[PDB]
Amino acid sequence: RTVANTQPSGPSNSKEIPALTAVETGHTSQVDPSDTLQTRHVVNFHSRSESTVENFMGRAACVFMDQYKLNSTDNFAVWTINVREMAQLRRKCELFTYMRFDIEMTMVITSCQDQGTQLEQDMPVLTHQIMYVPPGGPIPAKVDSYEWQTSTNPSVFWTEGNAPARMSIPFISVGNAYSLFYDGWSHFTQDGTYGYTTLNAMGKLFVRHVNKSSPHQITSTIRVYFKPKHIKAWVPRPPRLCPYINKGDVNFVVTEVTDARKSITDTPH
Amino acid sequence: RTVANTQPSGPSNSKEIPALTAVETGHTSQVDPSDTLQTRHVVNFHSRSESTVENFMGRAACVFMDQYKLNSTDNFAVWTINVREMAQLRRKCELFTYMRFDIEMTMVITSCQDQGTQLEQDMPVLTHQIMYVPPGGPIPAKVDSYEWQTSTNPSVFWTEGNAPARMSIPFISVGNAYSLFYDGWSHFTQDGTYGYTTLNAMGKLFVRHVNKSSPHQITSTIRVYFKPKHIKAWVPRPPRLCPYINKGDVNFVVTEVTDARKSITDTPH
Amino acid sequence: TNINFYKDAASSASNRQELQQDPGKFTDPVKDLMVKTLPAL
Amino acid sequence: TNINFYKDAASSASNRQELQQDPGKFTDPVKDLMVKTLPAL
Amino acid sequence: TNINFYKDAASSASNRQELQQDPGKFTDPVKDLMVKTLPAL
Amino acid sequence: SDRVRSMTLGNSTITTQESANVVVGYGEWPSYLSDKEATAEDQPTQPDVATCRFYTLESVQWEKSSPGWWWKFPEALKNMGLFGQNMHYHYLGRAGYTIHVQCNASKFHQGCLLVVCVPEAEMGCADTSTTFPATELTTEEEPHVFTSDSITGKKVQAAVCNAGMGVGVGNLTIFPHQWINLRTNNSATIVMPYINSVPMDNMFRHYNFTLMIIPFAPLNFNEGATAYVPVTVTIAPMYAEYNGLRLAST
Amino acid sequence: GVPVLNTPGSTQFLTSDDFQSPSAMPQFDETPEMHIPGEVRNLMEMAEVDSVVPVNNITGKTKSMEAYQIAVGTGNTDKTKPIFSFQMDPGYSSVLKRTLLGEMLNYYAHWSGSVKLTFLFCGSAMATGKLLISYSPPGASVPSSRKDAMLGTHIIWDIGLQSSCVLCVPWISQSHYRMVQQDPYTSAGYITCWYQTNIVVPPGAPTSCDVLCFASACNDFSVRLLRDTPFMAQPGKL
Amino acid sequence: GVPVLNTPGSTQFLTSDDFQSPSAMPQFDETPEMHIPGEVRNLMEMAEVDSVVPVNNITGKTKSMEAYQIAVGTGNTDKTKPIFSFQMDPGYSSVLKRTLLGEMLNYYAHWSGSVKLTFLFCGSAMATGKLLISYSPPGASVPSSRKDAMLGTHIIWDIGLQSSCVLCVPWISQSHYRMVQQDPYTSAGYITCWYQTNIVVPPGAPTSCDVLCFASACNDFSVRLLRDTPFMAQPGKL
Amino acid sequence: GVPVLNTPGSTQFLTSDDFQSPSAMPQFDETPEMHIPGEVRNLMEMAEVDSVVPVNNITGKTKSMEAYQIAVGTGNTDKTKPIFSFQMDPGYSSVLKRTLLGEMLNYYAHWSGSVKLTFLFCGSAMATGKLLISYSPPGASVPSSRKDAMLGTHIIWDIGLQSSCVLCVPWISQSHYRMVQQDPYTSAGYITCWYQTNIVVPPGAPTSCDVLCFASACNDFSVRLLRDTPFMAQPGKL
Ligand SMILES: CCCCCCCCCCCCCCCC(=O)O
Numbered sequence A, B: 001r002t003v004a005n006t007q008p009s010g011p012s013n014s015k016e017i018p019a020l021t022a023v024e025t026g027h028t029s030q031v032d033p034s035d036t037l038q039t040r041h042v043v044n045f046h047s048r049s050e051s052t053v054e055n056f057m058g059r060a061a062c063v064f065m066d067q068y069k070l071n072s073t074d075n076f077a078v079w080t081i082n083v084r085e086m087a088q089l090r091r092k093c094e095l096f097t098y099m100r101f102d103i104e105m106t107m108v109i110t111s112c113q114d115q116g117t118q119l120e121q122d123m124p125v126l127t128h129q130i131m132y133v134p135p136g137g138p139i140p141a142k143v144d145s146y147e148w149q150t151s152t153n154p155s156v157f158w159t160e161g162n163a164p165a166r167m168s169i170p171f172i173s174v175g176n177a178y179s180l181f182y183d184g185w186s187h188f189t190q191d192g193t194y195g196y197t198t199l200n201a202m203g204k205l206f207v208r209h210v211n212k213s214s215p216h217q218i219t220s221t222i223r224v225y226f227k228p229k230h231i232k233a234w235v236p237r238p239p240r241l242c243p244y245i246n247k248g249d250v251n252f253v254v255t256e257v258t259d260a261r262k263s264i265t266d267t268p269h
Numbered sequence C, D, E: 001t002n003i004n005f006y007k008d009a010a011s012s013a014s015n016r017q018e019l020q021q022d023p024g025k026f027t028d029p030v031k032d033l034m035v036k037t038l039p040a041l
Numbered sequence F: 001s002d003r004v005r006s007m008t009l010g011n012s013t014i015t016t017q018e019s020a021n022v023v024v025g026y027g028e029w030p031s032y033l034s035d036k037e038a039t040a041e042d043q044p045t046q047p048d049v050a051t052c053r054f055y056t057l058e059s060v061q062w063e064k065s066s067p068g069w070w071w072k073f074p075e076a077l078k079n080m081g082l083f084g085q086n087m088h089y090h091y092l093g094r095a096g097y098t099i100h101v102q103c104n105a106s107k108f109h110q111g112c113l114l115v116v117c118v119p120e121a122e123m124g125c126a127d128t129s130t131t132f133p134a135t136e137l138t139t140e141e142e143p144h145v146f147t148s149d150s151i152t153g154k155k156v157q158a159a160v161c162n163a164g165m166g167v168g169v170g171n172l173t174i175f176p177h178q179w180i181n182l183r184t185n186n187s188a189t190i191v192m193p194y195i196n197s198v199p200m201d202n203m204f205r206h207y208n209f210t211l212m213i214i215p216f217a218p219l220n221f222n223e224g225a226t227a228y229v230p231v232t233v234t235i236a237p238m239y240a241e242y243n244g245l246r247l248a249s250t
Numbered sequence G, H, I: 001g002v003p004v005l006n007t008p009g010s011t012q013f014l015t016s017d018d019f020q021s022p023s024a025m026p027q028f029d030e031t032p033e034m035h036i037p038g039e040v041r042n043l044m045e046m047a048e049v050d051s052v053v054p055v056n057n058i059t060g061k062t063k064s065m066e067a068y069q070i071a072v073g074t075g076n077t078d079k080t081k082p083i084f085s086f087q088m089d090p091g092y093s094s095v096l097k098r099t100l101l102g103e104m105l106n107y108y109a110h111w112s113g114s115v116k117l118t119f120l121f122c123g124s125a126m127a128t129g130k131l132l133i134s135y136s137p138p139g140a141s142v143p144s145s146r147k148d149a150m151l152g153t154h155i156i157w158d159i160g161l162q163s164s165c166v167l168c169v170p171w172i173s174q175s176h177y178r179m180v181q182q183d184p185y186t187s188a189g190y191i192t193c194w195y196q197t198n199i200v201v202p203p204g205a206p207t208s209c210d211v212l213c214f215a216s217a218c219n220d221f222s223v224r225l226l227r228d229t230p231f232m233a234q235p236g237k238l
């Protein structure tokens, strides 16, 4: 599974011109260092492991951080489920237009115990219900609404102090891939929502405290970490140089192509 | 296990009239899109998975939420064990008249630490005894009564801060199926309890704190989640359009057949 | 995997890998066989 | 090891031991085969 | 026992049952073989 | 020789004398949607030559100061023959486009065009808060020009350096790309197959890809050379299959 | 004992988990299973079976029986107007949301398959007419002329002895699974019924005949992502 | 039950863990996979594919298109000066950090392989000249004379019909994996382009021709240690 | 799921545990291993290799080079006195504690094996003399006369061309493993060097010759119980 070994080369004066190619063809030259220059026989035990899209997405990264409190809509956290909320994994997922990945969510929830005048009352271990409402499903409006009855909606019901909750999610896109980039309008009139927001509507994630109330306000932070696995990247894209501005669109502020250097001949050190 | 593939079709002028059927027969037409119209050969890799009654009931949903306190009858929670208490799983179970399901109860219990004048005393980890009294068995009247001695009554004795308690329950109905719908009176004189309350008398669930007392009032909420597994649905029923009013009867307030639209020709967008 | 670690049959994982289906109970409950390619009468 | 303890295919460990690679999709997408040892024209 | 439950080779128990030893790298590094039962010169 | 090329898709044919090898989109040749990968049960309308022909779009003058142009396909093919008619009269459509960009320049002309088919080139709004209308990115009649610098308003961010998608334009070669270098090339052909998550998608709401022609080296010609150097896009959908005959959408 | 490393998913109550649990009553002799007719091993079976849909769900008529009744008449007036029109997607369309396929659709987030709408002419036996029941795939405006509906998928229903024509929507979608929730991306087409010919009736038969539409699922039909139904709303404890 | 001893790594969320977890929706019928062209099973494939690099990243030119343009001229002035010079290491070099190999390098901490820089002469067809594109391995000063660049690894680019010479940096390193982050120990060499011969042009052709450098990865190229990219900085919630 | 009973050793970080843990970077391509000469697969190999010991560790001489130098002279004075004397146990003996075997001994609590002390005469080539290097097993007083040392294990070193006699302490112990820490029970013997004959030198050679003692481990040598070394003391953060 290792990369191709550098074949031994020698002096050459021929008509092969391996270095001389044409980018006009659009084909990146398949040349090796043995072609242009003279190289020794180096057996490359180096392997393109951890560079696989499966391994690259294997690193779990946050996609959703929100603060929901105990003792309105601030007692539970609502997440329009998209990878684009957090820039760290968004740019990874935006390296490819289509990724057919089974996403492994690992919720990390930490209670904060908000600083108040009175904080001398100790609440028992806080259980957390991370319910997933599929798109078009019943969206709860209160922390005790009927939607929290998980007849069909999956829910971990994670309790604090245990191992972080983790529920692997299959490939749920209506299409055959998750369109991270989708230059398309929601409506056929070409008017509406432009971007990944249209196709990447995978429901919502409502996070609440299973505990009814606490003597003092406790604002637990739900840190959702998305680990893509069984990924099928299908159309590669460059990383977005510009910083992410909107989580529902690719809208960006202009950014330099690279870090500017003093001169075209400016080589530090 | 996938659904039937759309067989290729072509132009047809014959006496078969696949589209022309008769609903007077009571038989839903077995026609395919290849029959009425002209369709390409589409291999349907789509499967009727997650639509199975086994998978549909696989999603665990709440059936019983109650608040029982620490430091009368309010110190333990009594549940006449029925799926109908919570509407979310009730309508799922009411999709079929008879369901022979081994029910997997997963109790989710979260302490609340009721807001009081003094809450500066920290109680150790609260253990919770979820006892099941079979129908006709000894029903406790106090949190420390002799009934809590579980000589025969199953009890998880779950402790807070651990994994949520889960005790799979076999098919315990006296009949050969759980009659979710039962248009029958309790007594042969046709006078008494009408509905599922008659046949679906599967005992009671008493939830208490194993801890004798606490310095301050703690009202833990028992959230019982029922996951049917090994389900045998036997007589399908439509979902109840009307909102559920009573948990012991099908009694309902009249509701529209569907969301009314402005006109018979009113097509939004 | 599919190994049952509990003796009781009910104390086992849900049979989510069973996709048996017989719509003919509801869609085709008539005594006389009805073929779509012939008039229903 | 490689034993899958969950019935659902998605509920399995990531396929981090698969190092399949076809750079020819991107590096060599031309219809006519281009050999480095000949002029590209 | 010796079963490796993690795919990565580094994510395995230490090889504490390997007692291979070659002191001749340090104790006997001379090019010409030196036998204790003869003068070293 | 590889420089000469001839593509006879449909009635229209394109013959070139200085054209490098055609860039098959991502190495896979376009084809009709197979029954295994088909999700629509309608009978596919497959005009082999009525719609699968070379459509010559509006030619845009490659000025010295031109930073770039983009066409949004297949919406750029509206009102272009029976391909556009089938777009209008069908809910779902799939096509593999062998775009052919013609830039006839003399041997004394300096310049280079990255003709790159970016699948799903989601364009960024000039003002990040709002969203541009459809007219700003759609390419029904004229190519939408990338601006040399940043622009503002309810339009598409046309900064050529960011390619309008917040992406390094020099890295746009990651997508199926061919270079029209007037030193060597005068025409670039990219045979891009149908590229989308869904096997067939509507051809109005969703643009299957965007053909971005980015002059990396601006056109440089001395006085006396032809100043009107045209960049003519001739795109031929291949294996075009449509499902869902419906009322024409306009 | 055995060295066990707890995964980050330990001590959680995932709702959709196939985890074995200890039996509440071990070795409990379940009541012997009997062959109760109608064993539902999938709710797409109850979707496949016909269901009268409330096509005429105009205000007030949902309370009465006229919601399902599709009114047709032997009158020249409004003959160039649709008998009805509604959205094809059973998930959010007002007509099809509370029907058997729709009710078994809003319990899910994704749906795929060919909806087949069986149209029963509930009129006089001598009332003969030709209708044009047309599913128009999305991407264009709702058909406002019978020609526009004819341009899409359509079936001519010649009302006769059979009295029931099945308009099978041939799953004209750009994605393998349309989304049950209302989203323009997976927005379905439009099912519109028009008059291909008037409902000719004898002088002794009523002109205002009725039609019933039975939206049913075909063998292709499937749902992929389960979700709590928005219809069943519980304001509080029962 | 089974005696299980929890390892000291229990109840932790390691980001790079191959731990199986319960399915959110068990037996969920994923949409059937279709052969979407361009399947990326490794991002070293997108590194291998060419990418125009911003060689002329002088202040202001990064905003415009002239960042990639490598200016060459038919003038005797500054002919003994490099056409360009920059650091070979794609990780931290200003020219190569935001290119395809560099962007897929700053997502990692270690990189190994032969960077190949394809240089495209974007000038007049009759503009013929010889350049000397030289990778000098580290350990010495940046080449300030064309002879110094010739002393290192170099290729003479005779601009002609092909118009693209590939300078393949032959991985001249003292370690199996250079570090992406800027460290003097694994500091790479210096890629400098000079004039082996002037860019001779006819009187009717522009003197100020342009060159594009395409830094691409060879088959040897690999990255070993993943890390969050320093380029993608998120000031706050989007 | 599987019934698992946690052992009383669960959720603990035992330092000496062979517990598998999840990989920080899964499928990380480690740099290929090269045959670097001198592969140490056991630190008893570095114990076995010779090491000059500070026999003459008198105050002040530990700072200088004279700690290793064992002074010998061509003088009748103090000829009936030991050339040196110290404790055999490398764990706590001042001479042998910081040597290669001793340093690899204080990293352990138990030690077993035959220490071999190679004595190199670093004097004039014509300086010939006979020494009596004697290991006396414990249980008796430290040898104060050459006869007492002769009564124990001893070797006569005839200084000549070889110039190095190896006094191999033949592991005279009452237990299979002596304890590295200073304890009288596993207290080792006493290594004392005396003059069997004077160091006769020619008139042109220095009388005050020097001797170097190389305490080395034999093939028998082993250490059994690891412990933090008392030598490496860290007062605070570096
Ligand atoms: C708590 C159990 C259920 C968990 C469900 C939460 C995850 C829903 C599925 C996410 C799909 C991938 C992310 C959105 C699509 C994309 O932009 O790639």
Ligand SMILES: CCCCCCCCCCCCCCCC(=O)O
Binding pocket: B081, B082, B083, B084, B093, B103, B105, B130, B131, B132, B154, B155, B156, B167, B169, B172, B178, B179, B180, B200, B202, B205, G024
């Ligand atoms: C704590 C261990 C014992 C658990 C016993 C609690 C569950 C009792 C059995 C419930 C049967 C199914 C629900 C009632 C019948 C129905 O309406 O379907």
